Ligand binder design. Structure first.
Ligand SMILES: [U]
Ligand SMILES: [U]
Ligand SMILES: [U]
Ligand SMILES: [U]
Ligand SMILES: [U]
Ligand SMILES: [U]
Ligand SMILES: [U]
Ligand SMILES: [U]
Length: 517
């Protein structure tokens, strides 16, 4: 943290943050969500980290170079250590990226190495080559060299993500899935794991072996797993919680802006809220049905009437304010809702649905006040505008993500947040073979548009391709875009260091501090 001249620090430097749900795991290779990554950034540190405004900056690597954007050389700081006092070396990164690529790990983020095009990743994922063939090597203890199969000018931006953080081989090997328990885990971030009580709290304490430990201020941070945004706000206003999770309740939000204006932080956020359709299961494999659902949803009602928290109605997957996004707003989004409804009803009628044989299906969402209230409104809108019947189903976060990968569901509430600020961070998740493709969408045309983005060496050509890729997704009605999120959360006046300037919201508790109050 960088404490400004003149601020008076509290004697006790502890923090309590809500984290939305119970984490899936603390193993960097088994996690895929925001809650998981929030904790991961305090415990595991990769080559680069985000600074407090979100710019990619030195992590374990103090400096790096590239040759033609294909061979990246990372110079690791000599004093980087794990929490047991042992050095963090390039060998740690070799083992860790191999483990991420290895099909035996079954990482949900194995395709992150495809997004960066590390050499030989496709064959490794397919089991055609051993994970030891991956295009990574340690040139010495403090030098990690990555070789890509084609130039990737933004490669370094990918490196702040948890999937490419190092894991401690000896602990993984000796304890298996219990390596993350407090007695066994070893971490290299600013914090260490103190306590993990499932569905109650995760408590982290300062890691004195962290290389930048002298700048760390907060001595202990607790992460809570509260999925009710109303409860989160209640425990924040009672004094227990210092920073809520950034999902706000429909119940109280209006009231909050009027009651505590300076505590309500509202900043840009590269995430898109949408209803994910299982594209591989009839009747959702019919483009007419998917289009009907996309068009009959009334975004103005949801975004401005039922939710109304600063979100913008969406017409795409990639947020239009992503760096590199120059999207074409489709004609259907400019129409009146009445015109969208008529076309939707027409399409469903063409698909064979009638009053006596209506379309009835499930809408899966993870436990949440926000998601439940929005799914109820969406069910009423689709019923009224299109005559379709929806059965709502809630699941807790970890189960919910597994269900979507299992891919026999109908429609699920979904939200993707960028891992790096570039359109492929969204677009690559819709590739036919992506490990993040929970839409189960497979379009050879779409895949080809993305493949061509690194075969041109011009930003305009790349941007026009990303725009065409969004058009391909939209033409196929792969998803039902609802709104682009804003990063809205409550932060006590005494919490310093949270700028809200990072559109990825990559917070590190090592950057925060408690002002005397
Ligand atoms: U004190
Ligand atoms: U650049
Ligand atoms: U940029
Ligand atoms: U269903
Ligand atoms: U509620
Ligand atoms: U460039
Ligand atoms: U106080
Ligand atoms: U106090």
């Amino acid at each position: 943290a960088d404490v400004p001249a003149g601020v008076q620090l509290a004697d006790k430097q502890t923090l309590v943050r809500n984290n939305g749900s119970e984490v899936q795991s603390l193993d960097p290779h088994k996690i895929e969500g925001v809650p998981e990554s929030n904790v991961s950034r305090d415990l595991f540190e990769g080559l680069l980290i985000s600074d407090v405004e979100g710019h990619p900056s030195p992590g374990v690597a103090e400096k790096w170079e590239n040759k033609d954007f294909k061979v990246w050389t990372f110079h690791l700081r000599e004093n980087a250590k794990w929490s047991d006092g042992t050095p963090v070396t390039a060998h740690d990164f070799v083992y860790s990226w191999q483990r991420l690529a290895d099909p035996n790990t079954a990482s949900p983020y194995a395709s992150y190495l495809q997004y960066g095009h590390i050499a030989n990743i496709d064959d490794i994922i397919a089991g055609k080559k051993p994970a030891t063939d991956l295009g990574v090597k340690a040139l010495d203890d403090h030098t990690f060299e990555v070789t890509l199969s084609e130039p990737v000018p933004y490669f370094y931006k990918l490196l702040v993500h948890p999937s490419v953080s190092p894991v401690p081989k000896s602990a993984v090997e000796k304890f298996g899935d219990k390596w993350t328990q407090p007695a066994n885990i070893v971490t290299n971030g600013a914090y260490k794991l103190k306590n993990w009580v499932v569905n109650e709290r995760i408590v982290l304490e300062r890691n004195p072996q962290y290389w930048d430990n002298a700048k760390t201020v907060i001595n202990q941070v607790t992460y809570l797993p509260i999925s009710s945004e109303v409860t989160d706000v209640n425990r924040y206003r009672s004094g227990e919680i210092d920073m809520t999770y950034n999902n706000m309740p429909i119940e109280l939000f209006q009231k909050l802006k009027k009651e505590i204006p300076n505590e309500v932080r509202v900043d840009p956020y590269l995430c898109t809220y949408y209803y994910e359709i299982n594209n591989q299961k009839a009747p959702f494999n019919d483009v007419r049905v998917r289009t009907a659902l996309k068009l009959a949803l009334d975004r103005d009602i949801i975004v401005n009437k039922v939710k109304n928290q600063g979100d913008l109605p969406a017409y795409s997957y990639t947020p239009p304010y992503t760096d590199g996004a120059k999207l074409v707003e489709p004609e259907w989004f400019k129409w009146s809702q009445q015109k969208r409804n008529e076309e939707a009803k027409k399409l469903l009628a063409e698909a064979g649905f009638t009053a006596d044989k209506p379309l009835t299906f499930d809408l899966l969402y993870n436990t949440s006040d926000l998601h439940k209230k929005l799914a109820i409104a969406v069910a009423s809108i689709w019923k009224k505008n299109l005559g379709v019947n929806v059965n709502l189903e809630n699941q807790e976060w970890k189960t919910f993500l597994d269900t979507r990968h299992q891919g026999t569901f109908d429609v699920a509430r979904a939200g993707w947040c960028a891992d790096y600020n570039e359109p492929t961070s969204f677009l690559n998740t819709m590739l036919s073979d992506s490990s993040n493709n929970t839409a189960h969408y497979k379009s050879p045309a779409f895949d080809k548009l993305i493949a061509d983005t690194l075969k041109v060496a011009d930003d305009t050509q790349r941007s026009e391709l990303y725009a065409k890729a969004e058009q391909q997704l939209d033409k196929d009605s792969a998803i039902v875009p609802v709104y682009y999120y804003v990063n809205a959360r409550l932060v006590k006046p005494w919490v310093g260091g949270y700028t809200g300037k990072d559109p990825l919201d990559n917070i590190y508790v090592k950057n925060l501090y408690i002002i005397k109050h």
